[PDB]
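Continuing from the previous page...

OK, I double-checked the sequence for Antimicrobial peptide Alyteserin-1C against my notes and this is the correct one:
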Amino acid sequence: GLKEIFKAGLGSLVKGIAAHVAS
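Thanks. Re-ran it with the corrected sequence; updated structure tokens here:
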């Protein structure tokens, strides 16, 4: 379902991406 893709996908990427800005 889209929930696994959304929750896991953004869950991992948001850290790798936002970390630079929201350290």
